[PDB]
Amino acid sequence: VKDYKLTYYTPDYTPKDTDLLAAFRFSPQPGVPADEAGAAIAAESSTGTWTTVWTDLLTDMDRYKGKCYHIEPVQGEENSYFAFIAYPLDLFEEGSVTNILTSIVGNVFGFKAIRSLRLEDIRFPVALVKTFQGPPHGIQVERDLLNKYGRPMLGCTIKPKLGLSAKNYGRAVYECLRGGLDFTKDDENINSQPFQRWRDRFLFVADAIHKSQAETGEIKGHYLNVTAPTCEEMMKRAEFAKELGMPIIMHDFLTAGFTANTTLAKWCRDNGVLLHIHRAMHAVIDRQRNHGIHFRVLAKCLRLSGGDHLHSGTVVGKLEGDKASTLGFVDLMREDHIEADRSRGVFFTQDWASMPGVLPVASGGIHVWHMPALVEIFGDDSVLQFGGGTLGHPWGNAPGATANRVALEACVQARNEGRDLYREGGDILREAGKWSPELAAALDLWKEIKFEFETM
């Protein structure tokens, strides 16, 4: 294989429809060529040899190995390439994400002759999509259960408060839910801690939910955090939350793992609750643009494993170079057939075979003056979380909830009537803030945006 073309870099090879494709962006050490680095990445992810000394001992082989079938330079960067690799279908267990991860990214990221390696995308065949479960409910079933059509959903997180008793926690949840919001969310790092155990929190939150829903006439909820040390504790928390009659729970799919997330998704499917996934500890994996695992791969693996909501981050304050990528992987988890398009980061054509979708959640320091943009970017199949834009109203929590509700309905009605939402957000919100003091106070507390010429 010195001058032979390595039997692992076969550019004249076209992949079957039952092959798992992967796209790596790599940068090789000084002196090492590109095609050899591609073939070596192909040999690391599988049987770690180029030769036939070990494998062909008594019968056929060369059917459990990957093949780098394409290499091309990245535009705008030097010493940086894209390699495409195609693995067979016999290498992967049926129904396990752990196995796919540990078989692809198992020990290739430690290759010594590579400066840096990144996994940009991945393509699961339909034959493999059909062996997984998917989201417990999806988008339409979830919409039917919550009985909320037309508009995006509203939520609030009680984030900057750590040390509250259980009763005051229930009281704040009640004041928010009564005011007009739909979902309230726990803090992402609250568990059974000495100042606030879990069963007390569950009790008082359930009481608040029942009171508010009974006296307002619609379905409301609170994401209860069931992340636990062991699986026995996790199952105990989930069973008790179902007993109280709670519609939705929460979980962290990166610190707890994929085994626990798959177990919880199967439980939720059997017992009929919705699952909200919170992406924590992710910037450890995908922040640097030269090493790690880009987030669209993890979004795909979550749509396979299980989950109904997923945090995806806002785009109101991003460049088009990255706003395009975020819109790309937001379409990658709602639709049913996505065509290849490199401007939006989608490398391969993916077909999901009637598997349901997940729901994007846009959170983090947003207020009323963003409500126009958010309504026309994400559409109406999404959830909007207001951390500080609700609890900070000059005179309480329920008025803040009412302000957010009024603004959202004004914007969606204006979009239905045909008006624009980029050159017409400010005057819409000002015209709506005429016959309501809450929205007027909210508009005066924060400040406008004034994006650019006429649009984004």
């Binding site: 806002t314 951390g387 500080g388 900070g392 003091p437 106070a441």
Partner: protein, 79 residues
């Protein structure tokens, strides 16, 4: 009030608007404490408490949301 969209000190991270206080003075009563002009139709009439701050002469700050700095899950957008 100030018109910094979301700005810090020249080099520091302290948000310039509130100067790290996390709270500003009401812009309706100018720290006075009582309302000055009838505002909507007459349900908020002069002489009573301020219609915005409810009589505290102190409100939160928009650009820096209660965080003395710029960046983080309170003042910026999560990616």
């Amino acid at each position: 009030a100030n018109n910094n969209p979301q700005g810090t000190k020249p080099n520091s991270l302290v948000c310039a608007n509130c100067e790290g206080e996390g709270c500003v003075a009401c812009s309706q009563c100018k720290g006075g404490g009582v309302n000055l002009i009838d505002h909507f139709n007459g349900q908020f009439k002069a002489g009573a408490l301020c219609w915005l701050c409810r009589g505290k002469k102190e409100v939160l700050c928009g650009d820096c949301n209660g965080a003395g700095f710029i960046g983080g899950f309170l003042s910026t957008f999560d990616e």
